[PDB]
RNA sequence: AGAACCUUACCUGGUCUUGACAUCCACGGAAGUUUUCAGAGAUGAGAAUGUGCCUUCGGGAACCGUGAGACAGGUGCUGCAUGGCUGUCGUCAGCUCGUGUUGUGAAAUGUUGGGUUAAGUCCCGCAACGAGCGCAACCCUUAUCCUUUGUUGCCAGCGGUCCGGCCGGGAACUCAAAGGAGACUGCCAGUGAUAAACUGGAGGAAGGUGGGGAUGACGUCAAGUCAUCAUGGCCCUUACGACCAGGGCUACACACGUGCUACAAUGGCGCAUACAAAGAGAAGCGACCUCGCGAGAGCAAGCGGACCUCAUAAAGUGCGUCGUAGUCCGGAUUGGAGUCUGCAACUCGACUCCAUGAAGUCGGAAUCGCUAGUAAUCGUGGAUCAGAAUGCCACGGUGAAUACGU
RNA sequence: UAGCUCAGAGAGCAGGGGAUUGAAAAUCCCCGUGUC
């Protein structure tokens, strides 16, 4: 992926981090295992105003070195090839060939 | 006293304790007929007995864990075989010939990359 | 129990952890502390599969594994000196240790 | 589409890893990128310092980093002073204090890393590719190496057509994990394309020694 | 579909527009680049120019449209036939 | 099979009658590895067959095979330029296999509420030398009697 | 009908 | 290894230009906060708020913003420019070199001839003699034994027990992860050129390579990838760069490729009910208990995990269950109605419910895999992941038929 | 006289689809083949 796409991604996460507390509490109001009527509706409208990016569903997992949006792995971070690369040269602590 | 044996078929490990009595083969507290269903299973556990003299003169205490009917039943049989040999050191001949002393090393083959199972391969198209 | 502490050593190798294990057990016995045996627990083997090709050809896949070794040692008698010694004691960097009394 | 990386296959038995810091599924992710960034930085600042293996260990609340550097026609004078000012500006990249060792590289010829770096510097200075290979081969053989196998690939000579020459002297086994063959890679950024360099130095079987003891 | 416990979702920009429109009896088409909203009882009889990707299709909200979203009434693909 | 010489795999006898012949039969009849349902259908079918004709299960079963079992088949040998259908005698072990195979095939073909009902009537007809299963034996023999002229070069 | 009647009861109408 | 928006590179609607990212100096403002409103959102106005910290009182590190410059920028171009990785022939047994010799010479020889082998594997032979990348072994996993170690794992010998390893007790055994041991063609006999090898036989958990997995020789295909990345040259550069609102990537007269599920009574449901492995889990898994057709939800224990959690194994069995019907087969499709995931569920998610109940009764020519725990089978798990598997990857359970032979 | 070429609206040829072809003709199958 291009450098620009990585720049857009870090902006998405940064905006979500700043409003993380507000989103957590606001959604709590909208539920409370069945809550109010008007209060609930106002909370919904507030979330709308609230910058889209701030939503944690607006982030795409990308390689921390290249930004590839596909083939990501939570564990080991990196990406498909990137894992290998580090593991292959001997930077990953423990990976090797599996012959079970 | 106690006579011990270890059996293993696929993934089941069986602990056998032999002591004389009135048969009543107990498998994990439950009774024989209860633990085993399919007639074939019960027949194979008792194969060494009929093969030798103590068909039911002694008793068999069995604890088994893991695997399924086959594995569990087969491991119980294998444990009885080794334990009778330890008790008499003379049943080898008949037991060996009956291929009972041999540990069945057949295990579930691991799945391989590019195949849906151990050996089955996705359907191939020539052109 | 009687203030007993259990020490869990976690590493990624099959040698380093055993070598470090000797240090943590020999020391206690040397200074006269009863340390429970290095009981071995199942070595977690996480299995990963990754596409080795940047594009098509999805049969050229590679198999990786992580073997997490976790040894555990229990010292029933928590004598002050031995406990304090094990704390300050430095262990091989490769291995990692989770010191928890409970 | 063949020939696996000999280091990786032997990363458990024989070859050791370049990072041995245990972790979980949380902190691990971060630590990796920080290690990535520091290594690339150091390689740029010491590409002329005959660096060979920048071992990075992360002890409990520590990041001990080692460097297999020496001097490839330059110096070891205030190089350690530089390394200091470097770690002053590096330790902050990932936080936590840092302790730096310098595992001197005896007989640099036997280290495939160093040899490939030297060869690529020549290629940048436009040195007859054929000459370079023969020199490196002879240097390793005389200094004592059971076998050497160097490969050159890319737009050698400048022409638009590919090529892949390779010279081999002595035994360079690659199917016996009981060996100790080092396989560094180098991307020489010559004017025409990016000539690549890979060198195998079969230093000798570790039969008795087993791993990197 | 959307959970019943959360009620209907409407965009505030469109929502603000209809408020002004109803209090003034405006008949001009409502310009909107959004389709995620739902049909409200207070938009009955208005004409809204719903974007489809390149242009804004005017849709006249009727009584039977209550409860549906704006998106179901603005086809996005222009398809006549394959022959 | 180019070089690897294969012995013979031993099969466990059936749990009820201790017969190697019947243990093979349920294996051929078995589908999707569901042995337990296979012998249940077969055993109930054998009970019907034994009562419908008086004879013991084992003796009645053997007679039906003996009346359907073929003795000669036609192999396909690419003699010289063009292949011809060479009649060849079949080994006794293979005889049992083909007989049991046809029975299972003919069973599934016949229409009956329960396959048990099928197997029973099928074996019964076979003992009487009638039915679809025995019809194959004449057809196989007719093929090997019309082509009996090519009986001087075999494989 | 019902399109509005449904909306009325289903939603709290805030 | 997972398009609702995100992604996205696509369209299109609107913003924009030393640029989002990138330096360099001056410049201004600490930064930063909180809110208002323009507006689809980008972008655009407003405010209030703080105004720092480093020493020093200048300069600062910053940071945010202006301008100038140089530059930035392209998932633009070229895989017939490359690196690099990868496919492939093929785990096929080959490929070579040195030196000598021979032949004018390209070459040959070695490397082949007679044996043998999974093998250029070994043996005789011999103008060759040596060597090396392969093969084999060295690795991991499984199979049996030992030692070491008893956890939360274990429960034999213990007695008391609530019958619950539960709880004392213990270390037997299971289990586990370290050290090991062990199969060697060794042994025994036979055959073969007194060989190599083979053959049977004993012993032995294990026999010839015990079973897998890893490991791909020199090279081939100017194979594929510039959209991972790097990179060479060209081209672009108020735009082929960039932002953001909506759509497209799920479009359908159409053909193929790969899965899934059925065409049934091995079923078909009902109830009772037995037995696994492998994993994963901390804003996660979530016991429970309560409510809810269900889906769910409340309620909230514990659990960083041989402890707790996902969690139900299902194939199977026990009796009953219907009678060949488009079926109590199968059962797509829809007309709706709930929950749940998420700014957000229409395009274009997944699951639960109502109602609907098709095609399909074993599929022409053709064509696939597979020779043992294999095929066939039946679950479960896991990565990806807000949510979204018949895909992939793993893990159990059950469990065949057949090989004369070339 | 089925789109040709002949029939009394049949057959074949040609059509499409599936095969088979390194790959195309050829061939194999399946289907559609008309105001007499
Ligand atoms: Mg998402
Ligand atoms: Mg989209
Ligand atoms: Mg190419
Ligand atoms: Mg020569
Ligand atoms: Mg050789
Ligand atoms: Mg090998
Ligand atoms: Mg090409
Ligand atoms: Mg191409
Ligand atoms: Mg698609």
Find the largest Cα–Cα distance for chain E. 50
A6 lies within 8 A of chain E by CB: no
- C97, D22 in Cβ contact below 8 A? no
How many alpha carbons lie under 13 Å from residue C62 in its C-beta half-sphere? 20
For residue B78, give the 3-state DSSP assignment.
helix
Beta bridge partners of D147: D170, D202
What is the full DSSP assignment across C32-50? T--B---EE---EEEEEEE
F37, closest nucleotide (Cα–C1'):
H266
**Paired residues of B8 in beta bridges:** B13
Residue D186 β-bridge partners: D197
Starting from the edge strand earliest in sequence, which strands make up the sheet with B30-31, in order? B3-8, B13-20, B58-65, B23-27, B30-31
d(CA D96, CA D78): 25
Residue pair A42/C12 in contact (Cβ under 8 Å)? The answer is no
Helices F92-109 & F132-146, crossing angle to 10 degrees? 130
Burial of F105 from C-beta contacts in 10 A (0-12 / 13-18 / 19+):
middle
What is the Å distance from ligand 1's center to A17 Cα?
A: 16
Strands B58-65 and B13-20: antiparallel
Torsion from C-alpha of D9, D15, D18, D22, nearest 10 degrees: 80
From CA B102, how far away is CA B82, in angstroms rounded? 9
CA distances from E38 to A36, D40, E4, E22, E65 (A): 21, 53, 13, 17, 10
Q: How far is the CA of D181 from the centre of ligand 5 (A)?
A: 22
Retrieve residue C40's tokens: 């071995």
What are the E-state strand segments in F3-152? 72-77, 84-89
Find and give the residue nearest to H325, measured CA to C1'.
F113
Residue A97 counted as domain residue: no
Alpha-helical (H) ranges within F9-91 are 20-29, 35-53, 57-68
CA contacts within 13 A on the Cβ side of D2 = 2
Q: How far apart are CA D83 and CA D41, in angstroms?
A: 12
Question: What SS3 class is residue A56?
Answer: helix
Distance CA A95, CA D11 (A): 8
User: Beta strand D181-187 with D196-202: parallel, antiparallel or unpaired?
Assistant: antiparallel
Tokens of residue C51, six digits: 């596409």
- CATH number, position F97: 1.10.455.10
SS3 annotation, chain E = CCCHHHCCCCCHHHHHHHHHHHHHCCCCCEEECCCCCECCHHHCCCEEEEECCCCEEEEECCHHHCCCEHHHHCCCCCCCCCC
Protein B73 CA to nucleic acid H397 C1', in Å? 14
CB within 8 A of D37, min separation 6: which ones?
D93, D94
Q: What nucleotide is nearest B126 when CA is compared to C1'? A: H367
- Round to whole Å and give the CA distance between C18 and C95: 9
CA A55 to ligand 1 centroid distance, Å: 10
CA distance D89 to D104: 23
In sequence order, which residues have a C-beta less than 8 Å from that of residue A32 and are 6 or more positions away? none
Structure tokens at D16: 């050791």
Distance CA C6, CA F72 (A): 78
Q: CA torsion, points A60, A61, A63, A69, in degrees to nearest 10?
A: -50
User: What whole-number distance in Å separates Cα of residue C22 and Cα of residue D129?
Assistant: 53
Task: State the total domains in chain F.
Answer: 1
Biggest distance spanned by C-alpha atoms of chain B: 71
Cα separation, B10 vs E37, in Å, equals 60
CA–CA separation, D115 vs A90, rounded Å? 19
**Closest residue by C-alpha to C1' distance, nucleotide H33:** A18
The 8-class DSSP code of residue A97 comes to B
How many C-alpha atoms does A82 have within 13 Å on its Cβ side? 22
CA of A85: nearest nucleotide by C1' is: H85
Place of tokens 């607006």: A58
Least Cα distance to B21 among B50, B55, B52, B58 occurs for B58
Report if residue F34 sits inside a domain.
Answer: yes
8 A C-beta contact, residue E20 and residue E35:
no
Q: How far lies D24's CA from each of A76, C96, D49, D113, in Å?
A: 10, 11, 35, 31
Assess contact for C17 and C96: CB atoms under 8 A. Answer: no
**Whole-angstrom Cα distance, residue B14 to residue B64?**
4
Question: CA D199 to CA A23: how far, in whole Å?
Answer: 55
CA-wise closest residue to B109 among B100, B118, B101: B118
Half-sphere exposure of F153 (CA within 13 A, CB side): 9
| Strand H bases within 7 angstroms of protein beta carbons | 1-9, 11-13, 20-21, 33-34, 36, 38-42, 73-75, 81-90, 118, 131-145, 148-152, 155-157, 172-179, 203-206, 210-220, 222-225, 227-233, 241-248, 251-253, 257-259, 265-267, 274-282, 297-299, 304-306, 313-318, 323-324, 337-347, 349-350, 367-378, 382-386, 392-406
Q: Phi-psi bin for B67: left (phi > 0), alpha (psi -120 to 50), beta?
A: left
B57 CA – H272 C1', rounded, Å: 35
- The helix or strand, by DSSP H or E, that contains position B80, with its residue range, turns out to be helix B69-88
Write out D36-85 in H/E/C secondary structure: HHHHHHHHHHCCCCCCCCCCECCCCCCCCEEECCCCCCCCCCCHHHHHHH
Beta-strand relationship, D65-67 and D100-102: parallel
| Separation of alpha carbons F33 and C37, rounded Å | 47
Q: With contact defined as beta carbons under 8 Å apart, do C16 and C92 qualify?
A: yes
Does F89 map to a domain?
Answer: yes
Q: Give the list of residues 6+ apart from residue B112 with CB closer than 8 angstroms, or none.
A: B118
Residue D127 to residue F32: CA distance in whole angstroms: 70
How far is residue G10's CA from residue G6's CA, in Å, rounded to a whole number?
6
Q: CA–CA separation, B45 vs D109, rounded Å?
A: 68
Ligand whose nearest atom lies closest to the CA of A61: 1
- The count of domains in chain A is 1
Nucleotide nearest to A81 (CA to C1'): H228
- Chain B contact set for F36 (CB, 8 A): 38
D205 vs D81: CA distance, rounded Å: 37
Spacing, Cα D156 to ligand 8 middle (Å): 25
Give one DSSP letter per residue of B11-47, joined into a string: S-EEEEEEEESSEEEEETTEEHHHH--SHHHHHHHTH
Q: Is C86 exposed, middle or buried (0-12, 13-18, 19+ CB in 10 A)?
A: buried
Q: Do chains C and B touch (3 or more CB pairs under 8 A)?
A: yes
Taking the C-alpha atoms of residue D71 and residue D73, their distance in angstroms, rounded to an integer, is 6
State the residue for tokens 């998405």: A12
**Cβ neighbours of G12 in A, within 8 Å:** 37, 40-41
Q: Which chains touch E (3 or more CB pairs under 8 A)?
A: A, G
Residues in chain D: 213
Domain spans, chain C: 4-102
Annotated resolution, angstroms: 5.3
Write the CA distances from D26 to C69, D29, D31, F153, integer angstroms. 18, 6, 10, 76
What distance in Å separates residue B73's CA from the closest CA in chain F? 15
CA-CA distance, D72 to D78, in Å (whole number)?
Answer: 15
Single out the residue of F126, F105, F137, F103 nearest to residue F53, CA to CA: F126
| Paired tokens of A25 | 């509490």
Sign for the CA dihedral angle at F66, F68, F71, F76 comes to negative
Q: How far apart are CA F148 and CA F84, in angstroms?
A: 11
Kindly tell me the sign of the dihedral angle through the C-alpha atoms of D104, D110, D115, D116.
negative
Minimum distance, in Å, between the CA of residue B40 and any CA atom of chain F: 5
Q: For D121-161, give the secondary structure using H, E and C.
A: HHHHCCCCHHHHHHHHHHHHHHHCCCEEEEEEECCHHHCCC
Closest listed residue to residue C20, CA positions, set C89, C102, C100, C101: C89
To which residue do tokens 């245990």 refer?
Answer: D22
User: E strands, chain C, where?
Assistant: 5-11, 39-40, 44-51, 61-75, 96-100
Structure token pair of residue F92: 């006794």
Cβ atoms of residues E60 and E30 within 8 Å? no
Q: What ligand is nearest to the CA atom of residue D162?
A: 3
D207 three-class SS: coil
Three-state DSSP class for F98? helix
**Could you tell me what percentage of chain C is helix, strand and coil, using 3-state DSSP and rounding each to the nearest 5?**
25, 35, 40
How distant is C1' of H323 from CA of F128, in Å?
28
Considering CB atoms only, which of A81, A93, A98 is closest to C64?
Answer: A98
Q: Which domain holds residue A51?
A: 1-90
Contact assessment for residue E74 and residue E51, using Cβ atoms and an 8 Å cutoff: yes
Q: Residues 1-30, chain B: which have Cβ under 7 A from strand I?
A: none
The total of other beta-carbon atoms located within 10 Å of residue A57's CB is 7
- C-beta atoms surrounding C71 within 10 Å: 23
* Contact yes or no for E83/E51 (Cβ under 8 A): no
In chain F, what is the straight-line distance between the N-terminal and C-terminal CA atoms, in Å?
A: 16
Which residue reads 């740029």 in tokens? D44
CB atoms within 10 A of CB D58: 23
Distance, CA of E27 to CA of F54 (rounded, Å) = 96
3-class SS of residue A18:
helix
Quick one: fold of C4-102?
Alpha-Beta Plaits (3.30.70)
- Distance between CA atoms of residues D15 and D5, nearest Å: 12
Domain ranges within chain B, ordered by starting residue: 1-127
Q: Give Cα separations from D172 to D117, D133, D176, F80 (angstroms).
A: 20, 16, 10, 54
Helix (H, G, I), strand (E, B) or coil at F73: strand
**What method did the depositors use to determine the structure?**
cryo-EM
Rounded Cα–Cα distance for residues B43 and B40 (Å): 5
Which residue's CA is nearest to the C1' of nucleotide H12?
E54
Cβ–Cβ < 8 Å for F47, F40: no
Contacts of E11 (CB under 8 A, 6+ apart): A48, E32, E34, E36, E37
Cα(C57)–Cα(C39) distance, integer angstroms: 45
CA dihedral C7, C12, C18, C23 (to 10 degrees): -50
Considering the domain boundaries, does residue F14 fall inside one?
no
Integer Cα distance of A12 and A26 in angstroms: 19
What residues have CB less than 8 Å from C92, skipping those under 6 apart? Answer: C16, C19, C20, C23
Measured N-to-C along each axis, helices F132-146 and F115-127 cross at an angle, to the nearest 10 degrees, of 50
The torsion angles phi and psi of C29, rounded to 5 degrees, stand at -60, -40
Task: Read off φ and ψ for residue B25, nearest 5 degrees.
Answer: -60, 115
Q: Where are the domains of chain D?
A: 16-106, 107-206
Instruction: Give the dihedral of Cα atoms D190, D191, D192, D196; nearest 10 deg.
Output: 10
Distance (Å, whole) CA A8 – CA A60: 10
Long-range contacts: A24-28, Cβ < 8 Å, 24+?
A: A26/A50
């Amino acid at each position: 992926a291009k450098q620009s796409m990585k720049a857009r991604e870090v902006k998405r996460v940064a905006l979500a981090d700043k409003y993380f507390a507000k989103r957590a509490e606001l959604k709590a109001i909208i539920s409370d295992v069945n809550a109010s009527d008007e209060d609930r509706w106002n909370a919904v409208l507030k979330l709308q105003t609230l910058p889209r990016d701030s939503s944690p569903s607006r982030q795409r997992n990308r390689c921390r070195q290249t930004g590839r949006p596909h083939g990501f792995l939570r564990k080991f971070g990196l990406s498909r090839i990137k894992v290998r690369e580090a593991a292959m040269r001997g930077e990953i602590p423990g990976l090797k060939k599996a012959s079970w | 006293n106690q006579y011990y044996g270890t059996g293993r078929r696929k993934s089941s490990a069986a602990r056998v304790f032999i002591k004389p009595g009135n048969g009543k083969i107990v498998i994990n507290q439950r009774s024989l007929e209860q633990y085993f269903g399919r007639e074939t299973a019960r027949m194979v556990v008792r194969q060494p007995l009929e093969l030798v003299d103590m068909v039911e003169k002694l008793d068999l205490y069995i604890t088994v864990k893991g695997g399924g009917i086959s594995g569990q039943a087969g491991a119980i049989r294998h444990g009885i075989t080794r334990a009778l040999m330890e008790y008499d050191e003379s049943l080898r001949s008949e037991l060996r010939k009956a291929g009972f002393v041999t540990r069945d090393a057949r295990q579930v083959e691991r799945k391989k990359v590019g195949l849906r199972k151990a050996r089955r391969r996705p359907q191939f198209s020539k052109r | 129990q009687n203030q007993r502490i259990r020490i869990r050593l976690k590493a990624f190798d099959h040698r380093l952890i055993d070598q470090a294990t000797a240090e943590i057990v020999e020391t206690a016995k040397r200074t006269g502390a009863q340390v429970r045996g290095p009981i071995p627990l199942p070595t977690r083997k996480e299995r990963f599969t990754v596409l080795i090709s940047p594009h098509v050809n999805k049969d050229a896949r590679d198999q990786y594994e992580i073997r997490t070794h976790l040894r555990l040692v229990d010292i029933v008698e928590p004598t002050e000196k031995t406990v304090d010694a094990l704390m300050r004691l430095d262990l091989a960097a490769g291995v990692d240790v989770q010191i928890s009394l409970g | 589409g063949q020939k696996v990386h000999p280091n990786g296959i032997r990363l458990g038995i024989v070859k050791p890893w370049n990072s041995t810091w245990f972790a979980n599924t949380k902190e691990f992710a971060d630590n990796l990128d920080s290690d990535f960034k520091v290594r690339q930085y150091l390689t740029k600042e010491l590409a002329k310092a005959s660096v060979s293996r920048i071992v990075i260990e992360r002890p409990a609340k520590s990041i001990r980093v080692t460097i297999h550097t020496a001097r490839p026609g330059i110096v070891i004078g205030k190089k350690g002073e530089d390394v200091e000012k470097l770690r002053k500006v590096v330790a902050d990249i990932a936080g936590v204090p840092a302790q730096i060792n310098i595992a001197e590289v005896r007989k640099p010829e036997l280290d495939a890393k160093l040899v490939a770096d030297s060869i690529t510097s020549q290629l940048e200075r436009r040195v007859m590719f054929r000459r370079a290979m023969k020199r490196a081969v002879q240097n390793a053989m005389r200094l004592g190496a059971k076998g050497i196998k160097v490969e050159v690939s890319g737009r050698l000579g400048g022409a638009e057509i590919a090529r892949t020459e390779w010279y081999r002297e002595g035994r360079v086994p690659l199917h016996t994990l009981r060996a100790d063959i080092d396989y560094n890679t180098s991307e020489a950024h010559t004017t025409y394309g990016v000539i690549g360099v890979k060198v195998w130095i079969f230093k000798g079987e570790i039969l008795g020694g087993m791993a990197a003891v | 579909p959307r959970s019943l416990k959360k009620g209907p979702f409407i965009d505030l920009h469109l929502l603000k527009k209809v408020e002004k429109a109803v209090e003034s009896g405006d008949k001009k088409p409502l310009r909107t680049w959004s389709r995620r909203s739902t049909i409200f009882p207070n938009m009955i009889g208005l004409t809204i120019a719903v974007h489809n990707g390149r242009q804004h299709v005017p849709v006249f909200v009727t009584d039977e449209m209550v409860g549906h979203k704006l998106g179901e009434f603005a086809p996005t693909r222009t398809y006549r036939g394959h022959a | 099979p180019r070089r690897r010489v294969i012995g013979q795999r031993k099969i466990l006898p059936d749990p009820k009658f201790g017969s190697e012949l019947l243990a093979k039969f349920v294996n051929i009849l078995m589908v999707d590895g569901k042995k337990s349902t296979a012998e249940s259908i077969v055993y109930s079918a054998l009970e019907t067959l034994a009562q419908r004709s008086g004879k013991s299960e084992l003796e009645a079963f053997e007679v039906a095979l003996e009346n359907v079992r073929p003795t000669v088949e036609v192999k396909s040998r690419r003699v010289g330029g063009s292949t011809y259908q060479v009649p060849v005698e079949v080994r006794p072990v293979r005889r049992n296999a083909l007989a049991m195979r046809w029975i299972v095939e003919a069973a599934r073909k016949r229409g009956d509420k329960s396959m048990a009902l099928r197997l029973a009537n099928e074996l019964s007809d076979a003992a009487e030398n009638k039915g679809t299963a025995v019809k194959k034996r004449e057809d196989v023999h007719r093929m090997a009697e019309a082509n009996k002229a090519f009986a001087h070069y075999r494989w | 009908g019902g399109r509005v009647d449904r909306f009325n009861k289903r939603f709290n109408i805030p």
